[PDB]
Amino acid sequence: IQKKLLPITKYRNQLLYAVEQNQITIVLGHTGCGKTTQIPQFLYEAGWASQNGIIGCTQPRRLVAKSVSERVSLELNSPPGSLCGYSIQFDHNVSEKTKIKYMTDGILLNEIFFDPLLERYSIVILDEVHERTLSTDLLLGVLKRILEKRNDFRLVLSSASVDANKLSQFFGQDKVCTMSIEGKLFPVETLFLQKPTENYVDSAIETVININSTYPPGDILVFLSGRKEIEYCIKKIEDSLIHASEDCQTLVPLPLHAGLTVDEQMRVFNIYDGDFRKVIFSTNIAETSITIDGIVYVVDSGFNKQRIYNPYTRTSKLINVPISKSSAIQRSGRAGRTMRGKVFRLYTEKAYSLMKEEFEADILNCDMSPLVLFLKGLGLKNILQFPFFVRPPTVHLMAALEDLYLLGVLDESGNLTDPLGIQISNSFLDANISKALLTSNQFGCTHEILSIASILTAGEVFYNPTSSSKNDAFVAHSSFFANEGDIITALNVFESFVGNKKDLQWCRKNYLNYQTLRQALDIRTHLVRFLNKFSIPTAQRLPSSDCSKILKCLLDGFVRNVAHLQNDGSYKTIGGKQVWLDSSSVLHEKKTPWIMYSSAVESETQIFVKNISKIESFWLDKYYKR
């Protein structure tokens, strides 16, 4: 019944006709209208998956992929995984009988790498391509090529942004139809300031207070730059509650950002009975995949935080940028789902006249070193031959290529060097981390490096409470403080983690993130299969306590990321960069003479390093001399 209520039912015949008669179809629509969930059902009913055919619909988000797969399996009244399944990066839950497949972009790139022509799929629908992920756009570039070779293969493009004309030019107008669905949205009136604001949160708090006292009940969703102002708004909203008048509703503030624990992110969905008005202080999470109902009034600051990587310094910084035009329309239209709502963007239309229309792709805002490995593995000598939708900056490509050359994966001619280069190309991870695993075979200690890599890719394995439990967390970790750095501390924690019977109460007691450890287990299992692809045994352990050769492999893996202490308390990277140690690391003030890190995060004044591990100079000298 819910299938039939969606607006997409009335386009079924038209969508099928366009998809069949056109090699590539561009579908424009709003999230939640049924494009994500009902297009697979519609073409399965048409018969696209008939006779061994498979429906591979790409969902670039792992959680979204799994959730949509489960929803489609349940909506078709079929056992999970039988007809519809999900395949996310380093986690496979599929079956031979599965017809509707929701898959991640990286695995699909790997399948292209092994199978250049995708003979097992007759149709693939690209969904949620609006986020412009690196993997998504690389997949689009390769997919134009496969449509070039394959006349039977069909493409359906679903996007929440108006990019069809550029895609139409890129794909050729004679083979793409630009169709737009006519949804329904309650009319939303925009309100703009006559003069530019000086302090947008103070402008925001003024409007938030004015909405409560003068407008009918309804939750107000705000848009703020980042998580630092969220608590600031909590404090003023609490003070306003203390001084609230009898004519104003009890206004509850609710944070919503990426760094929260899931339960905190579940706190927002709670229903507050009585005269309680929710206000969600969301940075940018309440923009996609969030469907909180009852949102009426939205005040938009026009600023959003994002990430930029610096190739010259190999750093990454969180900077504030004015939002794009598309984001402004999405923010205005978010309010008004259930009833009429108004938006208050804290700037003037003259300010709107100047922002750039659409945010740049992550293929243009991420690390391209994994991308070059992909093209070189496919066999593309000249990177310029690949059909990029937007030309990536050449200097970034050159930074990645010089990094790969000094890494040894590329020769003087720029081609993959020895089995090392191809084996690195076969690895999902970055070339830097994979080198330690691949060189561990010469030394018979792959296991501890495998655990290190799994911990690094899975993420942070320690939990730091914000309450008084910080001392308790510190004491719980106090048993496993390694003199040699966090990396061997992580190794000890990983070794003893499996030694405590996978007890979840033990993980809680020791403030250890069990989820990260499980994900590391899946990563290491898949990398074991990856090494066995090269017939490398994975029973190799070092029986001796000397972690020195593990450190040789790591220094071979983090050649560039070394630094030594300066008198001023900072460290000089080998590349002449002034960095400061992060407070989280154990070796905060030990004044270790020589240090080695993995990742660098840069703030407006200090460049901070993570994953701190001590080293000795003569190892570096002997490694550099050869």
Partner 1 sequence: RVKNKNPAPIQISAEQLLREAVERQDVAFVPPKINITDLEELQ
Partner 2 sequence: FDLEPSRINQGVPVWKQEARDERNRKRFHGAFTGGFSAGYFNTVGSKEGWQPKSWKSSRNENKSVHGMTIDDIMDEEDRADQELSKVYTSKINTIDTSIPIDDPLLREFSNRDDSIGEKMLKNLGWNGHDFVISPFQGYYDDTKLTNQAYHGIGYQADDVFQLERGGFGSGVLNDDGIEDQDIYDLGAPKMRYDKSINIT
Interface residue list for partner 1 (CB under 8 A): 241-242, 244, 250, 252, 272, 276
Task: Report the partner that residue 241 touches, choosing among partner 1, partner 2, none (CB closer than 5 to 8 A by kind).
Answer: partner 1
CA distance 25 to 35: 13
Closest to partner 2 by CB, 74 vs 398, is: 398
Closest to partner 1 by CB, 242 vs 354, is: 242
CA 466, 472, 476: angle at the middle one, nearest 5?
120
* Contact pick of 11, 303, 428, 462 for partner 2 (by CB under 8 A): 303
Residues 372 and 218 sit within 8 Å (Cβ to Cβ): no
Q: 29 labelled as ligand-binding? A: yes
Task: Report the partner that residue 483 touches, choosing among partner 1, partner 2, none (CB closer than 5 to 8 A by kind).
Answer: partner 2
* Contact pick of 394, 442, 532, 548 for partner 2 (by CB under 8 A): 394
Angle between helix axes 228-242 and 200-214 (nearest 10 degrees) is: 40
Within 10 Å of residue 499's Cβ, how many Cβ atoms? 9
* Options 165-173, 397-405, 501-509, 531-539: segment touching partner 2 (CB under 8 A): 397-405
- Provide the residue type at 515 as one letter: Q
Q: 356 labelled as ligand-binding? A: no
CB of 112 to partner 2, least distance (A): 22
Task: Report the partner that residue 152 touches, choosing among partner 1, partner 2, none (CB closer than 5 to 8 A by kind).
Answer: none
Closest to partner 1 by CB, 250 vs 515, is: 250
Q: 274 labelled as ligand-binding? A: no
450 phi/psi in degrees, rounded to 5: -60, -45
- Tell me which residue of 599, 224, 188 sits closest to 432, measured CA to CA: 599
Task: Report the partner that residue 276 touches, choosing among partner 1, partner 2, none (CB closer than 5 to 8 A by kind).
Answer: partner 1
Tokens representing 432 are 């830097």
Task: Report the partner that residue 184 touches, choosing among partner 1, partner 2, none (CB closer than 5 to 8 A by kind).
Answer: none
Q: 32 labelled as ligand-binding? A: yes
Q: 172 labelled as ligand-binding? A: no
Does 387 bind partner 2 (CB under 8 A)? Our answer is: no
CB of 509 to partner 1, least distance (A): 26
Within 10 Å of residue 542's Cβ, how many Cβ atoms? 16
CB of 45 to partner 1, least distance (A): 47
DSSP per position, 352-371: HTTS-SSPPPGGGTS--HHH
| Strands 100-103 and 613-614, bridge-based pairing | unpaired
DSSP annotation of 533: H
Question: Which residues 337-376 are close enough to bind partner 2 by CB under 8 A?
Answer: 346-348, 350-351, 355-356, 360, 364-365
384 phi/psi in degrees, rounded to 5: -70, -15
Q: 610 labelled as ligand-binding? A: no
Residue that the structure tokens 């690195």 belong to:
424
Q: DSSP strand E in 236-324: where?
A: 250-256, 276-282, 295-300, 303-310, 315-322
CA distance 300 to 209: 15
Tokens representing 414 are 């720029």
CB of 508 to partner 2, least distance (A): 20
Does 548 bind partner 2 (CB under 8 A)? Our answer is: no
CA distance 314 to 602: 10
- Tell me which residue of 437, 427, 541, 431 sits closest to 495, measured CA to CA: 541
Task: Report the partner that residue 414 touches, choosing among partner 1, partner 2, none (CB closer than 5 to 8 A by kind).
Answer: partner 2
* Options 160-168, 246-254, 452-460, 613-621: segment touching partner 2 (CB under 8 A): 613-621
DSSP annotation of 56: E
| Strands 303-310 and 315-322, bridge-based pairing | antiparallel
Does 80 bind partner 2 (CB under 8 A)? Our answer is: no
* Contact pick of 4, 235, 267, 560 for partner 2 (by CB under 8 A): 560
Angle between helix axes 514-533 and 446-458 (nearest 10 degrees) is: 130
Closest to partner 1 by CB, 18 vs 244, is: 244
CB of 16 to partner 2, least distance (A): 38
Burial class (CB in 10 A: 0-12, 13-18, 19+), 125: buried
How many residues in the chain?
Answer: 626
CA distance 358 to 131: 11
Q: 34 labelled as ligand-binding? A: yes
Does 294 bind partner 2 (CB under 8 A)? Our answer is: no
- Provide the residue type at 403 as one letter: D
- Tell me which residue of 96, 74, 99 sits closest to 84, measured CA to CA: 99
Closest to partner 2 by CB, 172 vs 393, is: 393
Closest to partner 1 by CB, 230 vs 375, is: 230
CA distance 96 to 115: 18
Q: 31 labelled as ligand-binding? A: yes
Closest to partner 2 by CB, 40 vs 311, is: 311
Does 185 bind partner 2 (CB under 8 A)? Our answer is: no
- Total residues contacting partner 2 by CB under 8 A comes to 68
CB of 295 to partner 1, least distance (A): 20
| Strands 295-300 and 219-223, bridge-based pairing | parallel
Task: Report the partner that residue 470 touches, choosing among partner 2, partner 1, none (CB closer than 5 to 8 A by kind).
Answer: partner 2
CB of 411 to partner 2, least distance (A): 10
Question: Which residues 408-437 are close enough to bind partner 2 by CB under 8 A?
Answer: 412-414
Positive or negative: CA dihedral 385, 389, 391, 397: negative
Does 190 bind partner 2 (CB under 8 A)? Our answer is: no
- The contact set with partner 2 (CB under 8 A) reads 195-201, 203, 302-303, 308, 310, 312, 317, 319-322, 346-348, 350-351, 355-356, 360, 364-365, 381-384, 390-396, 398, 401-402, 405-406, 412-414, 470-471, 474-475, 478, 481, 483, 560, 564-565, 572, 574-575, 593-594, 604, 616-617, 621, 624-625
Binding residue ranges for ATP: 29-36
Binding residue ranges: 29-36
